[PDB]
From a paper:
Here, we show that the Ty1 retrotransposon [name] forms virus-like capsids in vivo and transfers between cells. [name] is enriched at the [name] neuromuscular junction (NMJ) and transported across synapses, and disrupting its expression promotes both synapse development and structural synaptic plasticity. Because [name] behaves in a viral-like manner, we used cryogenic-electron microscopy (cryo-EM) to determine the high-resolution structure of the [name] capsid and found that it is distinct from the related dArc1 capsid, with a larger internal capacity and the presence of pores similar to those used by retroviruses to carry out their reverse transcriptase activity. The capsid layer is composed of the Copiagag protein’s CA region, which contains 2 alpha-helical domains.
Our purification protocol enriched capsids of sufficient homogeneity such that we could determine their structure using single-particle cryo-EM methods. Our reconstruction of the Copiagag capsid when enforcing T = 9 icosahedral symmetry reached ~4.2-Å overall resolution. There is a layer of featureless density lining the inner surface of the [name] capsid that likely represents the RNA that comigrates with the [name]-gag protein. Because the RNA does not adopt T = 9 symmetry, its density is amorphous in our reconstruction. The NC region is not clearly visualized in the map but is located in the interior of the capsid and is associated with the density attributed to RNA. The [name] capsid is much larger than that of the T = 4 dArc1 capsid (inner radii of ~220 Å and ~170 Å, respectively), resulting in ~2.2× increased internal capacity. Moreover, the [name] capsid also lacks the spike structures that protrude from the outer surface of the dArc1 capsid. In place of the spikes, the [name] capsid contains positively charged pores at the center of each hexameric or pentameric sub-assembly, similar to HIV. We found that [name] capsid formation requires the presence of RNA, as removing bound RNA using anion-exchange chromatography inhibited capsid assembly.
Numbering used by the authors:
A (entry chain H), B (entry chain I), C (entry chain F), D (entry chain C), E (entry chain A), F (entry chain D), ...: 3 to 186
């Protein structure tokens, strides 16, 4: 169907799963993976069962084709992929925290790009089962900033006391950014 | 309409066969390849045979169309392809096992390529008629790894208690590989 | 009576408040601070209030006597001190999260002192109302460990995340510490 | 009873007087100094008077008992001590203003001890009779700080007036100087 | 009551716990920690619990007050301190035994300091969960002394054993040190 | 009871006597020293006698115990100490006057210590039996000041001698002094 | 209550025992040590036993706290300390005698301190079960004197041995002392 | 009660005995030491004896406990101490008189210290079996002065020898000292 | 019949008298010397008088035979011998003990001679009336030994705690000094 779905090669599994779910819902097939099992099978509940399986097999890389083996239903294929990939794994959380602590701003990349990278990494870490509160997100973001971003954040903690949100600090940081570039 | 199935060109026959089988099952046609030959043949079987033959011919390379030039049903076409490119040879099995047990991971060559090599070898073993169980596959993969991974090998073989699978072990080895690369 | 209570010089307000409350409860005087103000006052209540206020003034450093110059009962003194200090500003919480995420094991310091520091860090972060799951504590404790702990970390990561408690992790880490000191 | 009150040595009269008053209130003796003279004096009143006199003499330095040599009540001793160390002398107020404005922080100096110096200057200046409010106090404290604090001082002076208290700004300066010594 | 108990700050937990238990026994409060939780909403029981908690907090250093910040029973605090400072780990016992077997003695350091070192090692080995009797204690001690003490170690070991105490051996060795001091 | 009273070592008898008298008054014992001996003695009077004698002996230096070795009451002990150390002597007070007329303020030493020296000198001169009026004290204070005070010394004498008290002139001298250091 | 008692650390057990006994008798507690065990125990006897045990534990050093680990009363602890430290043994008294023979008088130290030291030595020797006749004390005194006392020792040895008490020889030696110090 | 008494270390026994005697007099206990033994002894006598023994023991240094270890009343303890430390021997008196006859005034040392010196000299002479009245003390003082006092010594000798007192002659000598200091 | 009694020669008279009295009692004749003179003399009495006179004559030396030449009864002879030697001290025990304590082993002089000398010295000490116990004799013999015997000394005091006599310790010392003379 839609060719925008990159074949699943074991990376960014949540993105591939969301794309597959959206495409299945597009053809009125998503009900198979998350629905109610009828006590007896019907013709309507006979096509979507295998249509979803064929769709999943279509958008899978060659190595991962073993997840079906022509005997596992489409729901259970995704269930197995979930049990192997979207698992709350402590190793993934440690790796994500280690890489998060390594984020440093460089003059050769834009501030918005760094915001996007931070947001995606935070979302991935949240997917790893760990719980992060908004203030913890902000603190993780701030330690990445360089020394030039000193006065702005100090004013942030001193003045703001209740509007302390990731969106607000992002807005303040980006608004401050132009004053550095023209200053060099 | 599933264009992700690369037409067969004499290489990687198992994946092509699996994709073909999935597509055939999608269109309510695989029943004529797996099952029996009912004495009362009617339109339900004739149309299925015609659709299967058309799909096989379309998804085969022009040079490989010789396998279905004559009036041969899809079942015998698949039988011939199995007999020609999935030949059961015990000597081939022994040679494959000798080469697999001698496989080792080189420093300059990444874990993904080693995994692909192991996957193609195990696919050849299964094609050669050798019956290999998944824990045997896990053992074969772990014995061809350097000493730097010894710790995770011991941890997986002893501390892990759930039902081991190839993908899970591959994920853990990938995590160890990236951790080592950060270390080195 | 109890002479171990350091007079409040403006730091560790919770500790000083807890010690003062314990001392007042020892002489059965904490009832005035905590219990409701009786509609009719008697000699016992007046004596208890006088003794409580006297103890508060006695164990307060000279720079903070201003909190007691106003003719107010010990209840108002403690309430004012709570309003001034029993609150976590944005700066305090961000510094807490920074020092947690920037925590590292020094060479000379053993696991006992490091674990004590980590525990008090969590407690004072918990004192700010920041809910933290045991997984987050385990991850924070693992990231601050040096590179010589890699094997035990990898072993721990393979456990099921149903019995993973902080205490078991600390025990295994101390066991690894014994061997590391042996291997030096 | 309490031995925490250092004997009055001509310096920091306000703290000594406040602690003596608190101690007298502890033993229910402060009524002699503050309460009106009863028309009829009983055993209880004379006992309280002699106890107060003994307590004040005990916590007074030897050279300062010339005030008490005349057989007069402790109330008059406190009154005369107030008259001779708490006087409305304008020249003193001007000189202390001049020294307070010239209170630039030194590098080899701790902000807690700087706060103590400022607090003692303010207390003795109020003893000199010049009334200073909390706004004037915070302005005086902020003008003493070096230029490295300019960001937080600007931020806090942009804050609303109602929540501006000396303790609050002291906490903010402590929090920011934590970063200052961190950032070196 | 008893002042001799040094507040606990993470060193020699056994002595502190023993003295704390003795102090609780003085006030007849050991029933709270040692009883089979005879909870019968008794006011005497509540008073004993409060007194035990107050005494435990009293002789705890400010760093470790987090162990009793929560509203947990005195037995709860004691068992927490036990679990964190007396860990039944076999590797620690083995390392301690290896150190003991290679203790020996210095060339200038006097018998009292060696006795303190041996006592500390034995105490922490008992805290480690190793069952050791006084005969084993003496045997371990006697095998660390130089050749100048052979005459006394042989003499004491040929003794009829039965009722002999470690302190008696210490007294004999102190007398032997006094005697040998006059010559060397 | 009160341990602030320096043991009497033959120097500065008056303040030591005052402290002893105050301590006796606190325990309701001074009635022995000053109150008339009752015609009939009772247990309470004897207890007060013994307590006074013991207190006086306690707060005396060892060299001076001879004054109480004789079986005499506390009143007799104090009378003997008075007759020996506060005796009214002519040559003594002439020497005291000569020293006062030779008293000059040193540059390093501030008016507070100068005022204390003058006060104690005048007090012991009065004890010597030389009647001195307030204006005489004022003249002595004015004539013992350096040349930098000339403006204030000439100014103060112009005032009418009807309300010129020592406190007023001392306060004015301090107010002038704070200007004097300012011009240095 | 009395904090002058040095905690017992293995030196001079007799003073520690005497001080502990005196303190126990002071609080009306020594009856549990010397008085017979009552057939029935009341709350008073239990409280006295606990107080005695706690007091003994308080004045015991950390190294010797092992003497009271077991559930034993004050009597058992005291008798164990006696059996280990005041046992009447040959080695105990032999060292005492050897030091006594080495108690030579020093030039700077007068015979009062010498006699006191010798008296303490004899007392502790008697505590060691070495019954010493008064003449033996006298002889041990004389052998410790320098050549300047030859005349007096020759005089004393000629004296008849029926009423020769140590006090008489002490007085004669003191007279000889004063005569010698005259002749210098 | 009285805690200024330095524990007896073997020196200045007169002061220690006097202070102990005064303290016993405070508690109505001195009647045991000085009063005769009643034919029948009641509970009050037993309490007084016990308190006297306890007070004497507790103000004794550790080295001197042997003087009270035996079952001897406080009277026996004091008698033994007096015998061992104040012996009524003629040779002591003769040596003391020679020194006392040669006690001149050093120029650098004032009359107060010399009077003190003569005081303990005459006190120790009185301790021994010497009978000296006030007149011999006066004569000894007058022969122990330098040539500058010749006028006052001649004048004081001319006065009638019935109203002369030590205080009077000391006062005149002090006045003469005051006069002489002005002349040198 | 008892020829074990040394004839009296003017020394050790008390021993001779005691042995004579014991012998006379053994012969049922002591009633003559001790019992009262009967009013009428019987053949038994005169026979006893003759026997006692002859016995005493037998155990007198020739030089002292003059005491029995006169026609006097045995009672008169014994009374005269008492009047001449009943109370006289045998020798100066003081110098004897001083010699004993000053005894020291010399290298050339063999251990047998030292044992002999110590033996007779203890012999006069006992004979002159001084009471010495076995332990005291052992201590005296040990303290006069060099440092080369220390090992056997420790062995004796440790092992032989209940089996100690002069004979056994002397035997062990001889056994040890054999080897010691071998090791020189």
């Amino acid at each position: 169907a839609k060719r925008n779905i990159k074949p699943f090669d074991g990376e960014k599994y949540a993105i591939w799963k969301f794309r597959i779910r959206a495409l299945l819902a597009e053809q009125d097939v998503l009900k198979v993976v998350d629905g109610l099992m009828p006590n007896e099978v019907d013709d309507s509940w006979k096509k979507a069962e295998r249509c979803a399986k064929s769709t999943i097999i279509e958008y899978l890389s060659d190595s991962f084709l073993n997840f079906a083996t022509s005997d596992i239903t489409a729901r259970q294929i995704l269930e197995n992929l979930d049990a192997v990939y979207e698992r709350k794994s402590l190793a993934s959380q440690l790796a994500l925290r280690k890489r998060l602590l390594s984020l440093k701003l460089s003059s050769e990349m834009s501030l918005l790009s760094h915001f996007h990278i931070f947001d995606e990494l935070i979302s991935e870490l949240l997917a790893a089962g760990a719980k992060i509160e908004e203030m913890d997100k902000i603190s993780h973001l701030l330690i990445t900033l360089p020394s030039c971003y000193d006065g702005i954040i100090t004013a942030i903690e001193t003045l703001s006391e209740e509007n302390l949100t990731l969106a607000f600090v992002k807005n303040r940081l980006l608004d401050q950014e132009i004053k550095i570039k023209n200053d060099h």
